[PDB]
Design a protein around this ligand. Structure first.
Ligand code: MG
Ligand code: MG
Length: 739
RNA sequence: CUUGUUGUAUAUAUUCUUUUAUAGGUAUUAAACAACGGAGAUGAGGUGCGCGU
DNA sequence: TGTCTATTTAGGAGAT
DNA sequence: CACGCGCACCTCATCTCCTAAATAGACA
């Protein structure tokens, strides 16, 4: 495993934005040449031209004249079946002798080998590899249906070849024992694979021809790889350069050779590589060859690489804790009843209910659902409904929000004056996360409004919707992005999100070390993605309230009998400009409707703002150097399932086939689970059982493999959700919801 | 070189910002806890805005 | 006439 | 379900790459 360390240069360095810019321009010229000649030239022409121009017996010319590559397009040099260095050398020398990139030197007279050959050309080739190695016709990895449509069979044969990187029948023979010597082989699938082999034998040449045609037709007009105009980074791979420590200092020195002589760049020190540690030696002994020069905030940074010894522990399963992430009442609800035993732990829902100011404002049924959380180990009391009372002045939670904030900010000073640093940081970041999300909402809504205003004022007039050039030219020439107004908002938003990310990382570090210090050897999360987040419904927009919905200039007494629009007219969300006699003209958002839309956007924006899906990544990153490891479980299963009987609720479909139900149906009103427990406490106790029970563990997760970097100890299985269901019925852990 | 990046001060001043207002900008003051594999490219998705349907 | 720096070339992926 | 064409923003996924020896050229 290789890690990177970034240093900051001290003083003046010859590397500036001019050198980086010419590096980027060279990259773009070489990439343009490759893009133009990607499907036009043969490797044979290149190899022959170098053979007849220079004259040598090297291997990178022989490999281009070997009847395996002569009558092949240049894009085959970027595949994985071609030697990764012969292709580099052949392409480099064909480009160099013809001087196609337009190389005229570089500003600092950096060695051409370190700047052109293993500089921008190496990046060009590496980038074109990823494109062409990931260039394939996306076909479903499904069952071939045995003797299905001949078109289906032929596509199945060809796709599975590149799916498993096959070449010929020699690849099929290794596949035979692969499914014959496996537990529970799918005999029906094995017959399909037998048919796949049978049809492969007769029409193998047809497969090659179709594969060759499709790949070229997928690069008919690619446009090439382009280095963006904001990159501000150059990469040089130098074999012989020296990094030394500064004398009686914590800094370093980088003696790279500029213009046939060795320069000296002085670097600041890193606590990451602090003196006398076991990682400063790992750095100074095993550092790599690539040097990255990057400019961030008009300051130059140098990035190195070194070999690191991974030491991630193995799973233990002696102690386990679940953890559900749901952006409803508390962010992190875990699966341990709070009994005042976790050392260093602070419970904020127990703290808040001990003060009469907060409890008095709560109704009878709110105290009953706050006491539920005050007994469960929970983190980050992010109250979305209370938080929106900072943006909405005429709200009903405006008084609860102030008391909640006052108590939390008082705890923040109490913890600081008692010198409890970890808890103080946790609470301080909780407060700041709550404060920063409203700022992000404010700025994003202002960006939306200032885009609307700009586009209404400009009044871009374009023809019928057919194409890009067919549309107005002013759009590309004067886009909202390049307007100075929007350019500043996008920096304000970047800074706000930058604070949000750090506060979230601090909270997650608090949780991880809390569970590590006490003795827990696994933290179980679920593989959450953006689909789980239940978006609130935004009111239909005015521009499409009457145009799409066919309610444009329609009778006031009866516009239509659509029930949803009926509901929206029941309240005063919408205003309608009536005509002379019972029609519509225009609609304007009323105050209640506008604030309802804002409330719908405020809850929705936090799926992307607060990294709902990527919370698991922080725990996985912390697990690399920590004692406690992390297990991931399949999503869309734990929340609904009952943690008392350990079974899945389901509803009988019209056909009578059992259908797994949805979270909303298995949840009572008041957002409580029909089991009687909290909705998040229930899911946490489910995530735990899928890791505590050996029988369940093999169903949902994947087998323990050797430790890696940023890889969970237990990962979600690749088996399909339906396949999970059938195993979940083998163990009979299944129930019928209401029949 | 009591050293890099980010986070953590409801800290002191403000003729500042409603386009960060329990926060930030501009200058001072306090340290101590944490985490830290980077660069580039390609692709997918969501969201906003205009034009029309 | 050593001595440092820059250039050329590396062949033919397999087991999992 | 909004639909299509563009101007953008962000978040997320996946891939390449992080070498080493021999040799020629540039110096005093
Ligand atoms: Mg900040
Ligand atoms: Mg700092």
């Amino acid at each position: 495993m290789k890690k990177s360390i970034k240093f900051k240069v001290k003083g003046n360095c010859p590397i500036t934005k001019d050198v980086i810019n010419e590096y980027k321009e060279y990259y773009n010229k070489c990439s343009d040449w490759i893009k133009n000649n990607l499907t036009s030239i043969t490797i044979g022409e290149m190899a022959k031209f170098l053979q007849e121009t220079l004259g040598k017996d090297v291997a990178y010319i022989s490999m281009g004249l070997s009847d395996e590559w002569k009558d092949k397009p240049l894009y085959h040099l970027f595949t994985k079946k071609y030697h990764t260095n012969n292709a580099d050398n052949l392409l480099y020398y064909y480009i160099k002798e013809k001087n196609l990139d337009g190389y005229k030197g570089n500003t600092l007279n950096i060695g051409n080998t370190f700047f052109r050959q293993f500089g921008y050309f190496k990046l060009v080739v590496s980038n074109y590899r990823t494109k062409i190695r990931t260039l394939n016709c996306e076909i479903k990895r499904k069952k071939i249906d045995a003797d299905s449509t001949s078109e289906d069979i032929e596509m199945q044969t060809m796709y599975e070849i590149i799916k498993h990187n096959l070449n010929k029948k020699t690849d099929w023979d290794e596949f035979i024992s692969y499914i014959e010597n496996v537990e529970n082989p799918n005999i029906d699938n094995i017959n399909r694979y037998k048919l796949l082999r049978k049809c492969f034998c007769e029409n193998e040449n047809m497969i090659k021809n179709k594969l060759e045609l499709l790949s070229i037709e997928q690069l008919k007009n690619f446009g090439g790889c382009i280095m963006k105009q904001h990159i501000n980074s150059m990469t040089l791979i130098i074999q012989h350069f020296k990094i030394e420590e500064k004398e009686n200092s914590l800094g370093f020195i980088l003696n790279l050779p500029l213009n046939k002589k060795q320069y000296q760049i002085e670097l600041w020190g890193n606590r990451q590589v602090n003196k006398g540690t076991k990682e400063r030696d790992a750095f100074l002994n095993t550092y790599g060859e690539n040097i990255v020069f990057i400019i961030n905030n008009d300051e130059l940074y140098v990035v190195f690489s070194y070999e690191y010894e991974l030491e991630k522990e193995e799973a233990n399963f002696v102690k386990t804790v679940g953890l559900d992430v749901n952006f409803k009442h508390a962010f992190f609800v875990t699966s341990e009843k709070d009994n005042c035993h976790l050392d260093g732990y602070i419970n904020l829902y127990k703290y808040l209910l001990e003060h009469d100011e907060f409890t008095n404002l709560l109704t009878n049924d709110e105290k009953k659902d706050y006491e539920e959380l005050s007994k469960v180990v929970t983190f980050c009391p992010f109250e979305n409904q209370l938080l929106f009372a900072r943006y909405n002045k005429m709200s009903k939670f405006c008084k609860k929000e102030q008391v909640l904030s006052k108590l939390l900010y008082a705890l923040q000073k109490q913890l600081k004056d008692e010198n409890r640093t970890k808890e103080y940081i946790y609470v301080s970041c909780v407060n700041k996360l709550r404060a920063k999300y409203v700022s992000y909402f404010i700025l994003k809504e202002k960006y939306y409004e200032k885009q609307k205003e700009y586009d209404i004022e400009m009044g871009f007039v374009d023809d019928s919707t057919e194409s890009k050039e067919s549309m107005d030219k002013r759009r590309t020439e004067f886009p909202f992005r390049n307007t100075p107004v929007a350019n500043e908002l996008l920096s304000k938003l970047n800074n706000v999100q930058q604070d949000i990310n750090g506060c979230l990382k601090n909270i997650i570090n608090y949780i991880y070390k809390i569970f590590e210090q006490n003795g827990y050897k696994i933290v179980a999360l679920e593989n959450l993605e953006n689909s789980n987040f239940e978006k609130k419904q935004v009111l239909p927009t005015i521009k499409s309230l009457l145009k799409y919905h066919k309610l444009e200039n329609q009778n006031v007494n009866d516009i239509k009998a659509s029930d949803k629009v009926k509901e929206y007219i029941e309240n005063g969300y919408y205003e309608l400009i009536t005509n002379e006699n019972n029609e519509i003209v225009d609609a304007k958002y009323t105050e209640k409707g506008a604030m309802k839309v804002k409330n719908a956007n405020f809850f929705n924006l936090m799926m992307k703002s607060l990294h709902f899906a990527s919370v698991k990544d922080e725990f996985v990153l912390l697990s690399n150097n920590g004692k406690t490891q992390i297990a991931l479980v399949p999503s869309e299963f734990t929340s609904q399932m009952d943690s008392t009987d350990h079974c899945l609720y389901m509803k009988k479909n019209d056909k009578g086939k059992l259908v797994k139900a949805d979270k909303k149906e298995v949840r009572t009103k008041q957002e409580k689970h029909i089991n009687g427990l909290n909705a998040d406490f229930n899911a946490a106790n489910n995530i735990k059982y899928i890791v505590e029970n050996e029988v369940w563990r093999e169903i949902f997760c994947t087998r323990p493999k050797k430790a890696e970097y940023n890889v969970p100890s237990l990962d979600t299985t690749k088996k399909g959700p339906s396949a999970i269901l059938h195993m979940l019925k083998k163990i009979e852990a299944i129930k019928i919801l209401e029949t």
